[PDB]
């Protein structure tokens, strides 16, 4: 189905409760005469920006919140206008997840985090550490079984291990994310990916394992453990495997750190049905009955709606989900997230198959997750700081009573210097490549002259703190 005035088309991932969502859509049609169609196209999160402009998107797209800053940036999402009374019904932190440049750009639905799912009959006591898995697998392989299978094709599933002992996406520097500070190739990220790679090398896992292979393997009792989200529980219910949902194993003593997603629903900017979409989301879906219809099909996790979450919180599987979430981090929603995920996807696939070493693979991912101010731009910014410096010199211009004079040195404007003192200036904001927490230094001599380099006519200046992160 394609967009038409007076109908709704909804896209949601094929792993979620699309049948349940379809039932909410039919209730809406029964009440209003408005047809609601639910589809689950493959790679819908990649398809959406490619086809919205051409007229082939849906009215409403469901995805975790991390993709939505990119869509908003690209002008593909309508700002949503829920009143304060409606906002009060959902948890504050869920609204935060769907805020982009101070505007709400999606309705939050549910909070998702990966957990360790294990087969109680094969594994009464699941491992508390990643390190004990190899010996557990050797033991299980002897009984014609394996310890663990999970999706290796999507970095979302391997991220909790990469992040456990120090990998991170973007550094959160109070207020906001620093896109120049990526934590994909530090020591902890290498340690975590190396462990994954060694499991494969030692034949405790197969580099080609994907979602459906891991799910079939667990749901047929072939493997003792899997790693998956709440949506996976109803297929395990159908399978009648005796399963539990628990905290992810630790790596090097540190909790596994899942990236936590808020399943959200955005409205297509190209839709002529924005009001109908709002009405369906607020009055049909985001109700106890609406969410229960979906949850009954495939579990949502911990829902944004407080009234229904209060009932779901009682489920020990939801408790485990929340414990794992609490140990993880809510994903950024910034436009850069898709570049990050593509880079980490490539790294893990490449390292797992031996195409690259862990070192080669993560170095490249760092380069790509962080890959713009031009030189021409930078030159203008310097010219601006220079003019600002000259305007400053206009107005400005016994023992240790004569200061060094302010000057421009082609990078920084130096202020008045007290004679005999070191003068510190913050590494300037307008230099993109600088370390902005650092200082540059000059020395003002006792006579009020800036200190010169011995054997030369140049002024002594130390910019080593500024260029700290340029190797």
């Amino acid at each position: 189905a394609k967009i038409e005035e007076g109908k709704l088309v909804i896209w949601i991932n094929g792993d979620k409760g699309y049948n349940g969502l379809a039932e909410v859509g039919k209730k809406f049609e029964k009440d209003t005469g408005i047809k609601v169609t639910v589809e689950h196209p493959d790679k819908l999160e990649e398809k959406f920006p490619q086809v919205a402009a051409t007229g082939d998107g849906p009215d409403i797209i469901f995805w975790a919140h991390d993709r939505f800053g990119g869509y908003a940036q690209s002008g593909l999402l309508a700002e949503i206008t829920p009143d304060k009374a409606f906002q009060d019904k959902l948890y504050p932190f869920t609204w935060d997840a769907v805020r982009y440049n101070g505007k709400l750009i999606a309705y939050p639905i549910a909070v998702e985090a990966l957990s360790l799912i294990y087969n109680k009959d094969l594994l009464p006591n699941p491992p508390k550490t990643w390190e004990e898995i190899p010996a557990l697998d050797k033991e299980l392989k002897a009984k014609g079984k394996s310890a663990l299978m999970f999706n290796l094709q999507e970095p979302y599933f391997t991220w909790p291990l990469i992040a456990a002992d120090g990998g991170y996406a973007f550094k959160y520097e109070n207020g906001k994310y620093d896109i120049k500070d990526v934590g994909v190739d530090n020591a902890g990220a290498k340690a975590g990916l190396t462990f994954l790679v060694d499991l494969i090398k030692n034949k405790h896992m197969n580099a080609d394992t994907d979602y459906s292979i891991a799910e079939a393997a667990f749901n047929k009792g072939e493997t003792a453990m899997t790693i998956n989200g709440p949506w996976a529980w109803s297929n395990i219910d159908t399978s009648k495997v005796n399963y539990g949902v628990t905290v992810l194993p630790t790596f090097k003593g540190q909790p596994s750190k899942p990236f936590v997603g808020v399943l959200s629903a955005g409205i297509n900017a190209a839709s002529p049905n924005k009001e109908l979409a709002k009405e369906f989301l607020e009055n049909y879906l985001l109700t106890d009955e609406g969410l229960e219809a979906v949850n009954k099909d495939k579990p949502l996790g911990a829902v944004a709606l407080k009234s229904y979450e209060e009932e779901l919180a009682k489920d020990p599987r939801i408790a485990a989900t929340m414990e794992n979430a609490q140990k993880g981090e809510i994903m950024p929603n910034i436009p850069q997230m898709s570049a990050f995920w593509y880079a980490v996807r490539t790294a893990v696939i490449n390292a797992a198959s031996g195409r690259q070493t862990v070192d080669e693979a993560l170095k490249d991912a760092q380069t790509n997750a962080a890959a713009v101010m031009t030189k021409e731009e930078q030159i203008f910014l310097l010219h601006r700081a220079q003019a600002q410096c000259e305007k400053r010199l206009k107005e400005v211009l016994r023992y240790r009573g004569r200061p060094c004079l302010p000057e421009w040195d082609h990078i920084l404007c130096w202020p008045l210097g007290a004679p005999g003192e070191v003068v510190a200036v913050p590494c300037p904001d307008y230099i993109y490549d600088f370390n902005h927490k650092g200082h540059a230094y000059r020395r003002c001599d006792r006579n009020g002259s800036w200190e010169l380099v011995p054997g030369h006519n140049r002024t002594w200046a130390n910019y080593s703190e500024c260029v700290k992160f340029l190797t």
């Binding site: 890959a371 101010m373 030189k375 990078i411 490549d433 030369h456 200046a461 130390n462 080593s464 260029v467």
Partner: peptide, 22 residues
Amino acid sequence: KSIQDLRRRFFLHHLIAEIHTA
């Protein structure tokens, strides 16, 4: 990689080399 980073960073390296005298 990206050529704009290369040009920008090379430009800055050149400028720094003259001025940073420590």
